Amino acid sequence: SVQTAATSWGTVPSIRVYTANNGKITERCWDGKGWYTGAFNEPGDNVSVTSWLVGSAIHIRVYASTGTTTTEWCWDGNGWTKGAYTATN
Amino acid sequence: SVQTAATSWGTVPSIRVYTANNGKITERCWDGKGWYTGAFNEPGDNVSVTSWLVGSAIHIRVYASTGTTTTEWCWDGNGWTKGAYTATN
Amino acid sequence: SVQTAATSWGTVPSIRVYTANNGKITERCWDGKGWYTGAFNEPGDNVSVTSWLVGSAIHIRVYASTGTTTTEWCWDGNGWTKGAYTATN
């Protein structure tokens, strides 16, 4: 089966659901008005996510894994950028 | 192995743990006084969860996947109801 | 592929990422200053996590699964201790 991860924030709420399907992770978004496909699109067979608010601004971290390699993807208001995470050392 | 997803809220806390085991997802609940099996029981091989508070009221979203189909299940105070989520379009 | 779970707290933030790799779960930690391997090291093929604050103190629950057995691991300020969780009854 496909594998998913979810996060949410605020009281609307906003929800983001990430799905790993055939080696690709995609993103589905709710901001109160309907579901839409988000900008996130990166390789992975497994996904997890966390997020936090700084005031009203959301910050999201998606951890995408293929084989033994886990890559962190960061949203901080300006598109998806690679994070400093590594699995060891 | 079985696959799990967890969420929690407040300072007690309350915890909910969802487990996909042989194509079925079940729910275990802590509200401070012991673990009990919850009402949630729906098909799935994979599960993720998120939740949020509106005042003191909890809202939970469980994303259950089998094959390429992901179904959203909603708790909003009145049992489990199907959500509008779809994976694409 | 390896399987991960993530949680975070506060506005720094602190992040914890748990990874199940070849039957072992390990922990990676960010507290604002770099990634380091945490103390958590327990068996599992699948992992999920949740956490909550009581004032400034973090409490973490990691759910580690092998076969049909799910064990809860608790951080409450004093190392990792076994929790009361069981999957049924």
Ligand SMILES: CC(=O)N[C@H]1[C@H](O[C@@H]2[C@@H](O)[C@@H](O)O[C@H](CO)[C@@H]2O)O[C@H](CO)[C@@H](O[C@@H]2O[C@H](CO)[C@H](O)[C@H](O)[C@H]2O)[C@@H]1O[C@@H]1O[C@@H](C)[C@@H](O)[C@@H](O)[C@@H]1O
């Ligand atoms: C890629 C990275 O490590 N990002 C860091 C960020 O580093 C920047 C450098 O990559 C370079 O671009 O120069 C700038 C300016 O000096 C930074 O040093 O440093 C941030 C501050 O310590 C890290 O924290 C987040 O920064 C976000 C903006 O990028 C945003 O402000 C957020 O609120 C901050 O927490 C940032 O690290 C990334 O985020 C943290 C939470 C971890 O996930 C880490 O692994 C990420 O790389």
Ligand SMILES: CC(=O)N[C@H]1[C@H](O[C@@H]2[C@@H](O)[C@@H](O)O[C@H](CO)[C@@H]2O)O[C@H](CO)[C@@H](O[C@@H]2O[C@H](CO)[C@H](O)[C@H](O)[C@H]2O)[C@@H]1O[C@@H]1O[C@@H](C)[C@@H](O)[C@@H](O)[C@@H]1O
């Ligand atoms: C099934 C669904 O889409 N639920 C919506 C809800 O729709 C209702 C209709 O299904 C029908 O029953 O008529 C009523 C009254 O007009 C609604 O339109 O609409 C809600 C408001 O926009 C959605 O938001 C949540 O509603 C909950 C009560 O059902 C509760 O109040 C919660 O706080 C609201 O966020 C609701 O959407 C569902 O929840 C959101 C967060 C997503 O998960 C979405 O996919 C769910 O379907």
Ligand SMILES: CC(=O)N[C@H]1[C@H](O[C@@H]2[C@@H](O)[C@@H](O)O[C@H](CO)[C@@H]2O)O[C@H](CO)[C@@H](O[C@@H]2O[C@H](CO)[C@H](O)[C@H](O)[C@H]2O)[C@@H]1O[C@@H]1O[C@@H](C)[C@@H](O)[C@@H](O)[C@@H]1O
């Ligand atoms: C192992 C366990 O069940 N821990 C409980 C804790 O039980 C203690 C006993 O194991 C023994 O050591 O004697 C002491 C003193 O009487 C306790 O009874 O009882 C706590 C209070 O109800 C539970 O709640 C958490 O306790 C943490 C400290 O251990 C911390 O204060 C936290 O804020 C409390 O929520 C504790 O249960 C564990 O945590 C909860 C949230 C669940 O995850 C549960 O399955 C865990 O076992």
Ligand SMILES: CC(=O)N[C@@H]1[C@@H](O[C@@H]2O[C@@H](C)[C@@H](O)[C@@H](O)[C@@H]2O)[C@H](O)[C@@H](CO)O[C@H]1O
């Ligand atoms: C902050 C926010 O919600 N921005 C929306 C845009 O991005 C979507 O949400 C962010 C958080 C991240 O999940 C993106 O990958 C995702 O596409 C969105 O593109 C825009 C148009 O629909 O709406 C913004 O509000």
Ligand SMILES: CC(=O)N[C@@H]1[C@@H](O[C@@H]2O[C@@H](C)[C@@H](O)[C@@H](O)[C@@H]2O)[C@H](O)[C@@H](CO)O[C@H]1O
């Ligand atoms: C709000 C709440 O905790 N309700 C409890 C009842 O439902 C349990 O919790 C909700 C949030 C959801 O997880 C359910 O599937 C779950 O069964 C519960 O049945 C009742 C009796 O034990 O206790 C309520 O407080």
Ligand SMILES: CC(=O)N[C@@H]1[C@@H](O[C@@H]2O[C@@H](C)[C@@H](O)[C@@H](O)[C@@H]2O)[C@H](O)[C@@H](CO)O[C@H]1O
């Ligand atoms: C509360 C805290 O951050 N403690 C740090 C120590 O433990 C690390 O974090 C806790 C929450 C848990 O994740 C541990 O398994 C993890 O090792 C850490 O060992 C110490 C030295 O780096 O720094 C503390 O602040």
